[PDB]
Amino acid sequence: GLMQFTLPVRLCKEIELFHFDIGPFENMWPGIFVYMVHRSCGTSCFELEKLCRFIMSVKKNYRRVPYHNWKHAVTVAHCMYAILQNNHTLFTDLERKGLLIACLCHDLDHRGFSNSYLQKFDHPLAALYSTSTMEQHHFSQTVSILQLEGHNIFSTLSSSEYEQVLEIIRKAIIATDLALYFGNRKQLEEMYQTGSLNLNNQSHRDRVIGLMMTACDLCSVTKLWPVTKLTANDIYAEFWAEGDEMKKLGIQPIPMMDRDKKDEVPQGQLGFYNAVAIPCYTTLTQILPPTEPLLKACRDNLSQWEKVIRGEE
Ligand SMILES: Cn1nc(N2CCCC2)nc1/C=C/c1nc2ccc(Cl)cn2n1
Ligand SMILES: [Mg+2]
Numbered sequence: 001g002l003m004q005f006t007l008p009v010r011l012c013k014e015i016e017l018f019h020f021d022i023g024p025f026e027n028m029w030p031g032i033f034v035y036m037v038h039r040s041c042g043t044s045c046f047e048l049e050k051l052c053r054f055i056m057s058v059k060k061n062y063r064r065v066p067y068h069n070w071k072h073a074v075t076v077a078h079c080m081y082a083i084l085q086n087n088h089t090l091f092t093d094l095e096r097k098g099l100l101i102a103c104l105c106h107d108l109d110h111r112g113f114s115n116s117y118l119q120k121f122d123h124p125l126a127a128l129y130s131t132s133t134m135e136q137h138h139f140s141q142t143v144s145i146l147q148l149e150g151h152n153i154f155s156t157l158s159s160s161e162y163e164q165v166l167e168i169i170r171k172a173i174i175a176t177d178l179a180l181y182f183g184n185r186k187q188l189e190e191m192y193q194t195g196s197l198n199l200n201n202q203s204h205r206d207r208v209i210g211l212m213m214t215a216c217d218l219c220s221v222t223k224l225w226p227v228t229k230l231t232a233n234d235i236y237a238e239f240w241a242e243g244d245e246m247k248k249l250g251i252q253p254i255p256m257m258d259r260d261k262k263d264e265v266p267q268g269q270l271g272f273y274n275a276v277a278i279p280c281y282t283t284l285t286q287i288l289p290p291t292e293p294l295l296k297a298c299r300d301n302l303s304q305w306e307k308v309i310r311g312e313e
């Protein structure tokens, strides 16, 4: 009841910044997440005993893969926490509750392979879900864990508030399918420019939360240069493993996933920053002005990748 989570002074300050790194001590990540729910939502949002048991079952259902792991889950939740705290009054009590949960759960039971690799392998999940394959699996796993005894962190919600929050989480997690991001952002671009964008339109909110989710999901490109650089090693270890598996099925992988094309990595990051990250944080800054530091940080890291190509590191 009167039990605040507190963090050491350096974390208490740095956690409020977009570029915060949650550090290498796994055992502090849960407390960090609770800390963020309590400041983002209130100490009354979730029964503490239920929250802790939910967090530990979610942790247990993330796998020991190089990038799409429990660390990523909490990194993406922290970025969401930064967006919500810098835009206090634009979001409902239910959105604040659902979106941090959505981010923690968004890659549940990820195996470190793309939707493509599942479809080419002919994995059972590709038969059950034809599009956004892993993302429908992630939502399904979230619902599974919520239905474990003592795990229903939403128990105190009404029947219809429960349905609303599970629908926020579902759309949120589906949106992390980068194939859907491209059109979602084009539409948000047009609506903002023609002035038709209306945050009382529920389908407009949906799109805006969709963009926030892409922004949080990609936030490894908005960190201080050494964090960004080192996270890129974990990202390519998955990609190259997938390429190996593509070659095992008798298919040339895309260069991205070909470990014989290591040398081209800095140019590949450039493409990604230009085709994906910059446009994402640009459109987000237009819609939610206080998110500008994500744009600024992304631009800085782009400039560091140009520096790498130019042999200046
Ligand atoms: C398109 N392309 N092509 C390449 N390569 C061509 C040959 C060598 C590199 N690399 C990319 C994108 C990399 C990439 N993709 C993501 C996704 C999420 C996050 Cl957070 C960071 N990245 N970085
Ligand atoms: Mg994902």
Ligand SMILES: [Zn+2]
Pocket: 072, 076, 106, 107, 176, 217
């Ligand atoms: Zn993710």
